[PDB]
Design a protein around this ligand. Structure first.
Ligand SMILES: CC(C)(COP(=O)(O)OP(=O)(O)OC[C@H]1O[C@@H](n2cnc3c(N)ncnc32)[C@H](O)[C@@H]1OP(=O)(O)O)[C@@H](O)C(=O)NCCC(=O)NCCS
Ligand SMILES: O=CCCCC[C@@H]1SC[C@@H]2NC(=O)N[C@@H]21
Ligand SMILES: [Mn+2]
Ligand SMILES: [Mn+2]
Lengths: 388, 716, 115
């Protein structure tokens, strides 16, 4: 039914959702602190309100009740949490519904389920999924979606095996160097743990894979930063589907024309890189400071998800380093690689340090081109750090 | 292909400097950036084409949805664009059908129906910059002060929606039944004049909607048991449209929703309601009808000369409207002093009251406009009227003498029903007596003020800080003036006169100007002196002292003199008929042959063809136009047309805060201008450049983190 | 009211010629000025002299009441130098008393001129 959708987030993801709601013809509400007084996400929505001023940068997106106040004064019936703020907070989701508001996410019993590792493992054991006792593992994760009527579909795996420790540096979908069977076991298990607990809305089942064996890692009961990629290789709007699934629309229904499992494929390959203020020379500590020149890519197979990166206002240290979310698409993988590299050079940010020079040297490096890369790729590659 | 070809001008490729340029990204979207960016200069020698924005998606309609969204999201300011045209194509039933031909565009008229996106971003900058450099009129080109940021105590609107006072009462039991309720009350019910008469006296009527409506929540709770709010009529209608460039009807409507518990009240001049010339009856009807339709509840109806026949039209209109009609008796003279006048007697006022009751006014109002109703005269007067007539009595006065409180107290002794007041910081002198003062003034006395001092104190505090924004319009009068008991100039008048006196080179002779003022009164047969009839007596004295004229040589020398328009107008009866009459000698000399009117000027005028005004205003604009638009051009032709051009130039100015409205900004200042609930424009003025070859200055703002570029012609 | 009486008799006893009331804050409200001054007259044989500040705006209202109770002298200021934290305006008080049993002994026009 949804009349006014409020985004309990900021930067790129607020913008991502706003774009997806205004496609559905839904009135939009943004929220912000004094430090985002200059942010892009503010004017992307019909309305936007300063969540209480007496609140610093941090809690101005963490403050459960005060966010709901806004929600209530704006006559908001649905809220999208996005990620990395209140997304996985099950107290938020609970209090939410008590005030008449549809939390765009899994039912309250899922968030509690997939929080703690000891519960995460418990519901995974019941499923039939394998779990850990361990070097060279691969970080593969499966996107699924499921409406409030049971129905679930996986939108295939994402290879995130490029990560330093935390930080999912560079992400690929579908996987290269992963035989369709080897990887069928993964997607099938993904859906098998989801089918059991009657999952609702979109989430990700994470995995580590060793040649043939694999182990369950966690469940992200929300959207993902790297969703971009899966969208492009399937043509499915993931954030659109989210909102609509919450409004209670059937997948295979006329409003999200979902193909049934067998009809869903991946055409081509996509890859995304987050462009951040991280200094690849200084243990990836983010720059702050003012942006004096911002200039971007485009053309065939390039997709931009703007965030906090543009010609003006300075970047705060208080929120996540992320500036721009750049992605590329083509049939062959080599075409996708060439598009990222080129795109990256054409990408121009002056005034603060960026991860670009590093991010270039990951693409050029042919042991990434092979597909047989691993979670220890940054670990085992020194020439990955280059003076240039 | 997003281009600068104008869809409203046969695609004549517009040209110039692109101010804002903002993009769309996201799933399914692609951009091949041509010539549009940040600050591009668009050449007339190139295939004008700013970007190509294209969308993909599994299904056609989804492709269109992404395109539509992408088109609205795309933002290009400065030059023109074909964007509205492209949006319209995506909408169109024949396009979506897939079955369109090359004929499509020429077969599909609805496509060329665009609607101007009133660009509230650019317009706020283009306004602010203009006042910043060339300044406001009637101000000073100084920097920008106002350093007590007093907060605005407010009250949850849900709490309000649950108050139940007079507005509610008027819906249950009508006018007659409200007036019966007033009669029962022991307490003295008050009318607040803060929104209207207070500042019309003290701050040249300058108070903007934004200030009033900033405090609407608090006022509703503070005057929850008040009788009415005076927040319209008088000069406000004219001044808002004109000096303030805001629609009064909006102030009405908005204040209406914020205060849904309390009766609203205006001052309505018998002859012309709120206008400036004379008008046919049906303009009075229209106006009243609209007023009552949009929130006004009480209509205090007065005649500049206490001429009863002139207030029957307004009366019938108000009576039709189902609202509250208030018959006013302007007080002059002094019923204590029997040497003052044997016309403006205690019996004069009794009979007049008795007459108005027969006309069926719901409430009898007294409007001592010049503050001449001395305490004892008010005890005797009011006393007399309660037992003479049954209408509740509504007394209003001006603390011009310093005795306004005393007068009120006495009036209360005498059983009065309603008084007019204003919060302490907006009262005294030419204003009404202070509600705050009055509330304690009556302590340990039989009847009290039905109100809330503590809420009132808060108001006084607020309005005090708000008064500061209006420093430039602070009138001359710094203390009470008791000479008003001789010369009888209402509230202002002795100000303007002195500015005028000094202007016509009679600064040092003002004592004689005063003197001739009182004299001209008696020369004109001792007339009631409100507006516009106080300017008449104003102008004669001013003219008679200027041309060194006597009481007798105004007649003697007349046939050569050629008197002030305002005077000659008076003697034509263009302002009605004075209580005594016109001296036949004095009329002859002034008119010099001219036709004098017998009856009120209303039945000399032909009725207005409203649908012809509709016809004209529909054509002149794009096509809106309401009933409030119509009576509004009729009342003020020039001022209304000028408002519309400004509403076209700068959008809805009333939304700006007062200090930014009068001053613009200083270098490095950040202001927040709220354009609509949800849309607040955080602006920062970084710098301003020296003028160029043209006298065009360049203002570098930052708006919502984006830099902006404005060109302001410096007048010099 | 009992403290003020006791105080007055005592100051009378101390041999002062005139009892004064200092209202340095202008707290003496209208009715309070009728009752206080009313008592003090019958209680003591000293002429009462009353002095206030127009901070409330009811200074004039206060003087009229004091006058109604038989006060002998008040403290006043010229109109353009009156009101608020000053004395109640003589200029007003003069016309305020018009129609009442007690008049103000002073020169109307001279006081407009002084103002
Ligand atoms: C109504 C609207 C859609 C277009 O109308 P318009 O007449 O062209 O612009 P408006 O005068 O209504 O808005 C005035 C300014 O409001 C600002 N604004 C809009 N929404 C705002 C918000 N929520 N908060 C703060 N500022 C806002 C914009 O900067 C706009 O000026 P700009 O075009 O130079 O950037 C516009 O107000 C807007 O930008 N809305 C949000 C964005 C949007 O709807 N995008 C399409 C789908 S994402
Ligand atoms: O000097 C003039 C610069 C433009 C300022 C315009 C403001 S709008 C309100 C007020 N009314 C006017 O006619 N002009 C000023
Ligand atoms: Mn008045
Ligand atoms: Mn003192």
């Amino acid at each position: 039914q949804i009349k006014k959708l409020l985004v309990a987030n900021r930067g790129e993801i607020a913008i991502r959702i706003f774009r997806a709601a205004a496609e559905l013809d839904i009135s939009t509400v943004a929220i912000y602190s004094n430090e985002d007084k200059s942010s892009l996400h503010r004017y992307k929505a019909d309305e936007s309100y300063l969540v209480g001023s007496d609140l610093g940068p941090a809690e101005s997106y963490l403050n459960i009740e005060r966010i709901i106040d806004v929600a209530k004064q704006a006559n908001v019936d649905a809220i999208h949490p996005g990620y990395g703020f209140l997304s996985e907070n099950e107290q938020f989701a609970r209090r939410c519904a008590e005030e008449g508001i549809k939390f765009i996410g899994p039912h309250l019993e899922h968030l509690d389920m997939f929080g703690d590792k000891v519960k995460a493992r418990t519901t995974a054991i019941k499923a039939d999924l394998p779990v850990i006792p361990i070097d060279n593992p691969k970080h593969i994760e499966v996107q699924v979606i499921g409406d409030e009527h049971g129905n679930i579909v996986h939108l295939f795996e994402r290879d995130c095996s490029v990560q330093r420790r935390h930080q999912k540096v560079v992400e690929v979908a579908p996987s290269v160097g992963l035989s369709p069977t080897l990887r069928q076991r993964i997607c099938d298990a993904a859906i098998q743990l989801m089918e059991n607990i009657k999952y609702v809305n979109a989430g990700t089942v994470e995995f580590l894979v060793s040649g043939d064996e694999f182990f369950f890692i966690e469940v992200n009961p929300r959207v993902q930063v790297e969703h971009t990629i899966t969208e492009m290789v399937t043509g499915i709007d993931i954030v659109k589907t989210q909102i609509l699934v919450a409004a209670g629309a059937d997948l295979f229904g006329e409003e999200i024309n979902m193909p049934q499992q067998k009809d869903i494929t991946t055409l081509g390959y996509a890859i995304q890189c987050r462009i951040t203020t991280e200094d690849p020379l200084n243990d990836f500590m983010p720059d702050t400071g003012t942006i004096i020149a911002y200039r971007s890519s485009g053309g065939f197979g390039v997709r931009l998800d703007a965030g906090d990166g543009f010609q003006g206002a300075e970047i705060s240290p208080y929120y996540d380093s992320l500036l721009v979310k750049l992605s590329t698409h083509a049939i062959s993988f080599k075409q996708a690689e060439e598009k990222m590299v080129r795109s990256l050079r054409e990408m121009r940010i002056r005034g603060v340090k960026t991860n670009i020079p590093f991010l270039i040297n990951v693409m050029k490096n042919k042991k990434f081109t092979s597909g047989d890369y691993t979670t220890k790729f940054i670990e085992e590659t020194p020439e990955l750090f280059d003076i240039q | 292909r997003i281009t600068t070809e104008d869809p409203l001008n046969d695609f004549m490729p517009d040209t110039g400097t692109i101010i804002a340029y903002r993009s769309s990204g996201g799933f399914g979207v692609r951009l091949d950036a041509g010539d549009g960016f940040q600050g591009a200069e668009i050449s007339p020698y190139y295939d004008s084409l700013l970007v190509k924005l294209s969308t993909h998606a599994i299904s056609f309609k989804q492709a269109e949805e992404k395109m539509v969204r992408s088109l609205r999201e795309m933002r290009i300011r400065g030059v023109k664009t074909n964007i509205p045209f492209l949006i319209n194509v995506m909408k169109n039933k024949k396009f979506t059908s897939g079955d369109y031909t090359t004929k499509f565009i020429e077969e599909t008229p609805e496509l060329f129906d665009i609607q101007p996106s009133l660009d509230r971003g650019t317009k706020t900058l283009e306004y602010i910059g203009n006042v910043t450099i060339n300044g406001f009129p009637n101000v000073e080109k100084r920097p920008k002060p106002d350093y007590e940021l007093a907060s605005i105590p407010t009250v949850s609107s849900s709490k309000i929606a649950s108050f139940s006072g007079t507005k509610q009462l008027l819906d249950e039991v009508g006018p007659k039944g409200v007036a019966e309720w007033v009669k029962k009350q022991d307490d003295v019910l008050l009318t607040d004049t803060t929104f209207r008469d207070a500042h019309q006296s003290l701050l040249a009527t300058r108070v903007r909607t934004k200030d009033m409506i900033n405090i609407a929540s608090k006022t509703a709770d503070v005057f929850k048991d008040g009788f009415s709010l005076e927040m319209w009529g008088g000069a406000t209608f004219d001044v808002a449209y004109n000096f303030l460039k805001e629609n009064p009807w909006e102030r009405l409507e908005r204040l209406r929703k914020a205060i849904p518990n309390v009766l609203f009240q205006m001052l309505l001049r018998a002859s012309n309601a709120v206008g400036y010339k004379n008008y046919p009856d049906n303009v009075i009807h229209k106006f009243v009808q609209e007023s009552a339709k949009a929130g006004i509840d009480v209509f205090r109806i007065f005649d500049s000369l206490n001429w009863v026949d002139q207030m029957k039209v307004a009366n019938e209109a108000v009576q039709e409207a189902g609202k509250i009609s208030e018959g006013t008796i302007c007080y002059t003279g002094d019923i204590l002093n029997p040497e003052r006048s044997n016309i403006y007697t205690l019996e004069y006022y009794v009979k007049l009251a008795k007459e108005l009751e027969r006309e069926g006014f719901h409430i009898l109002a007294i409007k001592d406009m010049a503050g001449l109703l001395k305490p004892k005269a008010a005890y005797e007067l009011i006393g007399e009227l309660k037992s003479a007539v049954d209408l509740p009595i509504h007394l209003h006065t001006h603390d011009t003498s310093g005795n306004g409180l005393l007068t009120y107290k006495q009036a209360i002794d005498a059983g009065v029903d309603i008084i007019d007041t204003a919060v302490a910081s907006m009262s005294g002198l030419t204003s009404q007596p202070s509600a705050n003062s009055l509330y304690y003034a009556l302590n340990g006395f039989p009847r009290h003020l039905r109100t809330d001092i503590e809420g009132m104190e808060s108001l006084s505090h607020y309005w005090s800080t708000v008064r500061t924004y209006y420093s430039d319009f602070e009138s001359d009068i710094k203390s009470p003036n008791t000479e008003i008991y001789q010369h009888e100039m209402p509230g202002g008048q002795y100000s303007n006169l002195s500015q005028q006196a000094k202007s016509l080179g009679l600064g040092e002779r003002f004592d004689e100007v005063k003197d001739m003022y009182r004299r001209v009164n008696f020369l004109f047969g001792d007339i009631v002196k409100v507006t516009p009839s106080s300017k008449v007596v104003g102008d004669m004295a001013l003219y008679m002292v200027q041309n060194d004229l006597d009481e007798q040589s105004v007649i003697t020398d007349g046939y050569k003199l050629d008197f002030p328009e305002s005077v000659v107008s008076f003697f034509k009866g263009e302002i009605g008929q004075p209580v005594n009459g016109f001296n036949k000698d004095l009329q002859a000399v002034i008119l010099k042959g001219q036709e004098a009117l017998t009856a009120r000027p209303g039945e000399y005028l032909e009725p207005v063809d409203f649908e012809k005004v509709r016809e004209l205003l529909e054509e002149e604009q794009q096509g809106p136009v309401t009933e409030q638009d119509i009576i509004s051009y009729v009342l003020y032709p020039k001022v209304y047309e000028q408002y519309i051009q400004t509403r076209n130039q700068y959008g809805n100015l009333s939304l700006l805060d007062t200090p930014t409205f009068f001053f613009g900004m200083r270098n490095g200042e950040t202001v927040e201008i709220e354009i609509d609930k949800g849309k607040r424009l955080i602006i920062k003025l970084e710098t301003i450049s020296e003028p160029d070859e043209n006298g065009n200055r360049t203002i570098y703002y930052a708006m919502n983190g984006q830099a902006r570029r404005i060109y302001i012609k410096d007048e010099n």
